[PDB]
Design an enzyme around this catalytic site. Structure first.
Site, PDB file in Angstrom:
ATOM      1  N   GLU A 110       0.824  -1.466  -0.182  1.00 54.00           N
ATOM      2  CA  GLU A 110      -0.013  -0.213  -0.047  1.00 54.00           C
ATOM      3  C   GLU A 110       0.875   1.257   0.161  1.00 54.00           C
ATOM      4  OE1 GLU A 110      -2.779  -0.518  -0.329  1.00 54.00           O
ATOM      5  OE2 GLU A 110      -3.738  -2.384  -1.088  1.00 54.00           O
ATOM      6  N   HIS A 261       5.313 -10.514  17.108  1.00 57.76           N
ATOM      7  CA  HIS A 261       5.882 -11.350  17.721  1.00 57.76           C
ATOM      8  C   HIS A 261       7.547 -11.148  16.667  1.00 57.76           C
ATOM      9  CE1 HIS A 261       7.019 -15.334  18.280  1.00 57.76           C
ATOM     10  NE2 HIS A 261       6.602 -15.656  19.148  1.00 57.76           N
ATOM     11  N   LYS A 302      12.063 -12.056  25.365  1.00 53.58           N
ATOM     12  CA  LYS A 302      12.013 -11.255  25.214  1.00 53.58           C
ATOM     13  C   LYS A 302      12.028  -9.421  25.242  1.00 53.58           C
ATOM     14  CE  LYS A 302       8.909 -13.863  22.512  1.00 53.58           C
ATOM     15  NZ  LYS A 302       7.824 -14.466  22.418  1.00 53.58           N
TER      16      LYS A 302
END
Lengths: 337, 355, 337, 355
Positions: A110, A261, A302
């Site tokens: 896009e 993620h 993380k």
């Protein structure tokens, strides 16, 4: 102990003071204030010089991009590129303010298509039947005429021709990130995010690059010109090494799914990001990764245990321009060469 | 009393069509008949009514699928490059990774084991956690457990579920020899690996009837997962490549495989649990036939931020991903609550026909 | 340490085993299993005999209803009475399974109106213009013809006449709870929640009883027959004393707003409920009381520190019949006289 | 490539009307002009676009309100039983209790102080926490703080805000003498108390220009709160009644007062922050005039469970609560983020006209 107190409009409309007042206003206004602090901490780390030892370790990438004291990963879902946040993201990328982009297929295509034809305002309630009969595609309360994708096909097929030829006669091993750099070079237009990303050696990861119009075109193209390969394994090494050899990392993640993620999982490879801001409307109660709080990512490694991450529960089309106004935009001179 | 006020509040109403359905809940003075209780959701309202509509949509898929056809077996296999025989309705089932960590793993496994759907789409976590559960279990916890304490004890949180780091150590030991064989087969037997082909291999290797992917490859149900590197399987491929370089996973060929499943279908239905890639990739495949015939979404995402995850089925109609004359349904709920109920009322009732 | 494991349909469709399996399925299925356990704990407390000392203290209400070892407060928003959960709630009230009801104005009037005319299924997307032109009112995906409210006016105005007369000639001091008992006696129909509530001496609190059609009618009525008073102070004493003199309390709260806060605030007066289940779709991030987790109420003293409350994040039209099936309905014989 | 596939994906499109607005975000190469940044939300999409539409709706209310009228002052006061003069647009402002604990308290106070709206509706917490903040402050905290530790330290949590028990001890000391006077005035001066009349009294007593309700009574802006007993003011009325029995709070007369504010308006707008009673009570009052002319909702509730809180403005159109020809707007957001921005772009720009 900080007291709750909102901006007093008896002072007049002092915009910077009004924005500064979100921190003591409470609920998600306070989380916005914390996000400003987290992002400004990424920026003030990023502008700190690399010591000789830090410079040694961080130089261990084969990457052309100059390394800095804080490697910032910016992730965003496709809808945000349909929206006018495309302009916000383009600005950050144009001025080298972030170091790695992660987006979905829609978030690549896009941007390029907006260089050929615009997206328009509509309403969420417009009915699909009447839209489809008229070839108008709906993205939330935005509208994309299908002619936009016909222009995309025209523009893209010659590039696909060249990519297969370079694959088969020049030994090129394509990956999503290499294709996105090539597409940004080809669109050759300063309104495009991916134009500036390739110009500034900012890699873009999108492991499921076939899930969109780009996929449609590759699919059609493959009947007449078979054999294009897009390897996702090499791109996994590339993004993970961005985290592994960073001096510090920050994550700014807009939206959920793979972009969230994949950035977070890369940062596990260094035992966690130092700074993190999520902006999304997903909720934790169904167990989805999209709606998980930053503190879930802490359990995985993380995000570092000693980080102070924050989530702003809001539509990023409202808050991300405000966030940039209060952080990167105030330090623009430091990012210019 | 002001006359305009009376006229505004006490306005006359048109009579509604004679087939209009009255609201009425299940009456527990009947006792507890769970079949009747579930049937009563249809006339209870709000998402209970959407659940009843979803039962009807899926039962329509199943009834279509059970209609006989006559179609050339050899040309179908050639245009789809698939051994799977065509039926009168090709059903795509998509589900996000968290649902494979939940007990919905068992629900999905049952459907695939009995060959009741034709195409699976899931993210990387939705592959690897099915395999890991054949090595070690996932445990119940709470959403509010703090990440620092968990991390210090080597426990990883998935919503209110918990998995020890050691689960992934067992996964590593199991997976590394298989990755060795895959690289050897690529480099000396010409295998061109893709995610679906890898997932079929992994299901054959796990060799365990509790696994979704064991049943999927046995029954020739392909599994598409175009970002298969985004999780623990990714970690392992990554670490493995520094010991044994060269594995390639191509996504272009898998795009051809999924799209031709939609193009050459007689009819299609979509059953989509959650959002993200799994929802968009199934819906986009179905645009290639000008739209799915039937569709059920079950997810908790909301439309207002413009996300594809939160888009109603009627947005997909605008694109051509769902046919204009379909009657699709979204249930706004956590699938862990409603998917077993849905299966109980649909596929599990038709078990006799699926033998 | 309980392992995750879903129901195996290779066993066939064993409904009770399928429902029991929600507890080990995870996410909101596990929270549903915990809610079954919390409600069954309320029930097993409720059926335990009162000792002489407990009986002494709990007898200190002037209330006609026999006291039990666990006083259960059931709260629900108006939409649930529009829905078929009206039947679920009617069953519990009919069989004396709960002790105090709290609802909004809509949750009173729609029960009575359903005794005069039905509510119909519709869709959420039906457009307001065309509906209004046809006098059809929309409640989510339900539809109420405005003729329903015209029937309500006809039925109610003679009762309002009698209530003012009893106020002014017989010394009656009306409150919302006294009006709702009277309305339930008048509707005289066993399909009605409020019919059974008044028959079983179950008080119903609704401090904002004027916010609805009942309010419309009182308003119109007050021009021709002025002076009806509805005191909310006396009803505040009545609900608070239900909590203060309970041996144990449980709260089952469907939805948010006043019904949730008013039950919880009453239980603060005893230093907290012993058991609690919320079922609602509200989220905490905007700071609303509706979306606050049970653990917020613990900080106030509205839920005891040693309670194990649970919230099921779901539309109660899906889960509340299932919850009742697994709890109150299995103990029906114990509630019958 | 399959021909039907090409036809489905590459379908021709109609040209859109010439006045269609293009999507385009703010360009930070201009630097940081916050006015231009806020204006740019209109063409940014999703809820940013709804924010721009909400600026336009509120600016239309304000411009209507500023139009002169000629209307008989004495008959208006008689039919509404109110001293407040009629204007060309009666604006109702509703807000849930949590927003008075937040800094949005200051935003609301500014509007009421400058007489910019005509009717307030809030729940009990939205009254008492404004008064308590004149005695002691509310503090910043976190949503995840555990209730057991907080309770053991006498600290009460409101989202990510905190208020010590002692705040309510100060409230008790302040309120008890006023309740004494109210009972004396009821029993010997014939006062018939209602929530609005009590809230006016409390604002006069708090006598502090940081208080919303101080300004509301000074400016003759009534405050409706039909469940005023549901909170700490309720606790205090309750404890007080065992020391000094007999206070009555009637809700019937307040119903007449709010409904006549809508019936005898020239025009009405609704600005509603949050859901529950405050939203339904304003909207229902406006049904008495066959609908509000303008409406803005700002809340995070979702429609799918059928709740009134989550209902879109178009549901209210079906009832007659919003006029069929209105162009109402909902912004799906936490009001703590967007209401100050909204005020900055609307009422605070018109400050000169409001003097």
């Amino acid at each position: 102990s900080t007291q709750v107190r909102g901006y007093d409009f008896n002072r007049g409309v002092n915009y910077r003071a009004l924005l500064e007042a979100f921190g003591t206003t409470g609920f998600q206004a306070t989380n916005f204030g914390r996000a400003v602090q987290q992002v400004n901490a990424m920026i003030e780390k990023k502008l700190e010089p690399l010591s000789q030892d830090e410079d040694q370790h961080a130089d261990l990438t084969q990457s052309r991009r100059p390394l800095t004291s804080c490697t910032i990963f910016l992730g965003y879902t496709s809808n945000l590129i349909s929206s006018g946040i495309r302009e916000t993201i383009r600005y950050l990328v144009q001025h080298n303010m972030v170091d790695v982009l992660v987006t979905t297929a829609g978030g690549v295509e896009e941007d390029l298509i907006k260089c050929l034809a615009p997206t328009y305002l509509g309403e969420f309630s417009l009915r699909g039947k009447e839209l489809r009969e008229n070839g108008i595609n709906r993205i939330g309360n935005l509208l994309v005429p299908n002619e936009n994708y016909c222009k995309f096909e025209d523009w893209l097929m010659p590039i696909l021709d060249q990519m297969v030829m370079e694959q088969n006669t020049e030994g090129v091993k394509w990956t999503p990130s290499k294709m996105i750099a090539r597409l940004g070079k080809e669109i050759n237009n300063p309104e495009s995010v991916y134009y500036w990303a390739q110009k500034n050696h900012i890699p873009v990861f999108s492991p499921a690059l076939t899930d969109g119009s780009l996929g449609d075109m590759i699919f059609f193209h493959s009947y007449k010109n078979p054999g294009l390969v897009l390897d996702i394994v090499e791109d996994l090494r590339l993004i993970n090494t961005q985290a592994i050899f960073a001096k510090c990392t920050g994550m700014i993640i807009l939206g959920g799914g793979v972009v969230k993620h994949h950035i977070a999982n890369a940062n596990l490879m260094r035992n966690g990001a130092d700074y993190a801001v999520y902006i999304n409307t997903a909720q934790e109660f169904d167990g989805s990764d999209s709606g998980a709080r930053p503190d879930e990512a802490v359990s995985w490694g993380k995000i570092r245990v000693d980080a102070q991450p924050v989530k702003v529960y809001a539509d990023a089309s409202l808050v991300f321009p405000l966030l940039v106004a209060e952080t990167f935009a105030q330090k623009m001179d430091a990012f210019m060469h």
